[PDB]
Amino acid sequence: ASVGFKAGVKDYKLTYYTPEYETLDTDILAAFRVSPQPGVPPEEAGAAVAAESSTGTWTTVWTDGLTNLDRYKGRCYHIEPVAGEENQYICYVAYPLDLFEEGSVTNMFTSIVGNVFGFKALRALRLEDLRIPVAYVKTFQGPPHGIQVERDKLNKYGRPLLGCTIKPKLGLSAKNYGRAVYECLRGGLDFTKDDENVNSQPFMRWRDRFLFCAEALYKAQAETGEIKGHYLNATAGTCEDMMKRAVFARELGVPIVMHDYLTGGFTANTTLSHYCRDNGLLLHIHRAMHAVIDRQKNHGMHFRVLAKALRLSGGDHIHSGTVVGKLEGERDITLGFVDLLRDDYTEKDRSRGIYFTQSWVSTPGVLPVASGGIHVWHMPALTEIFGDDSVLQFGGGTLGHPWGNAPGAVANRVALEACVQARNEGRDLAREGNTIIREATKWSPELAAACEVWKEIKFEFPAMDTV
Template structure:
């Protein structure tokens, strides 16, 4: 009889929307796999259900406090970069695969000296024969140091440490030993348990979460798990910044969905630090006004082809993106600002703005 007191209870039904309450005693503190096995487990495979989508999870304070959450969050990231009043500008090394280590480091250098704050590995790059992890770390951080010396600006390299859990943690330790300050991880492909192990190592490294594979569970509007839930889980476990969609780029989410994802990263959660949203996927300088309108100033604009695809090369592409951000922050239209900034003018012409 006493077991019935621990049963989950439906407390609201509104059309197809159902809200369910679970007694906190059903969950082990600090164990995200356990929590997900209950609220996002076998129910998805029931024969009697044609569709079901997990839209949100509201966590009680006691459970939230059993996780570390972001080590740095928005404020900590801004302190590291010493940039407080504008969006951060980043790029992804392109082509995503195939570059030798020396060329990878060169492209990163060009992006930094052009004006990018952040350079990121592609999510597909790990330690392939043409670009080994340790060599890439050392050579690209050397390029970072050179770019910082030449520009007088802080520069960040986000190195992809995605791998088997023990190897991933070893790679993160190597990044730290070489003077790196950021790591990135494909959080869904490594799994929430591996992500939690990485965060529990509690290294002084900003964790950038890439959401590769998310659409397998988020894209169907009637079945799966919403990106809002994934964003919450990533933040609770301890990711400092996370891809959330763009609205205006090539990804599928609506404005409402992206705003919902952003809210999940910034809302009050029992004192957990807010997580920096990242916009990435089909972006270019002409989209900056719309992006800032959607995201505000606390986010990362991360463009690959929108920087490297500039007809004058990566340095010019990075300059164009920084010029677009500067224009919007000063309240000047891109077309007006482009009259005196040739890199931006060419970008607007290229992307037909």
């Protein structure tokens, strides 16, 4: 029944802590790691988070009476204390399907992650996971192509794909870029790519680069007999400019373009994902800016949430970290979100940071891309961590080779196939990696030289974000 309107403020827990609630299979569920300010009880913290990220505000408003608030309210249905933690809990919040705009990752984030992280009453807040209901999943296109279609278009099967970011990051001219791209590709790499910050600049305007890179990739393809691609970056300042770039790439008949989904944004990214689906272009996604958000364990959004969002918005590849390279990435956590990116069903598994069983109702899988401080000696670990369905990229690891780009590429290609052959023959990549690589140097001068150069280069630091 309706009860009168009683103006004034009251605890959020009165309406938003609902420990007896059984979640609907159409609900979007959120796992928040909540660190309350002293004096703020877990129930009120979790309730404040559920309220302000859905239907409520700081004082009682009469308008709730025009609606059915219990039908719409987000609600904290469970709270579990964090082991070894001083005043930190995992509060689970359930959000009704009706609260979200169909197909809009932008709307989903605006609600769940829009204002709650700045609450004075909380010391810190991290969104660890989201259980996206299949009824909401179906409102999205998902990847323009996906793993199966991509291998089919490229006629590539049985091994991880190989890429390479052209270096230096900034400063090269359009013709030099193509020159570098041709040498890399003719050596055995499947792709080369614009570094993420290469958009259009005084030192190299984009159309000139797209043009020279097309000449270069077509030349490497004719020489080797293997389909080649170069991720032409469509990231730009406006949707219009971004589209012009996607359009010129289409005109050139090349197979793949790229976009920075976070710096470019979800709205533009979704627009590009659809265009790519409409025009048969593969979309490689870079995650520039993610660590500003997902690095710390106490505050932010875990990458697995940013990865699920990208799979929804749409992308054929997504940088996923290297585990063993120069940037942070724990193996168990990485293996977990890689499954969330490629598979159709993933069961809850806290040892890998998976708080919710997630189903994708056939949304195509995204190919994880390992890039950043990796080289030939890392090949066995990379092949074993990711398996065939991944793209392994070596920028410095190719353009840093003492003999040039083509031999640098041959080195990486030989190392990978050596690992693929060994694995297929039953060898243990983890135990036998160095031997597999070492054996190959015996017949590949190119690999030997690369091995010579990077033999004792490791990146091993303490991780900031662990399970």
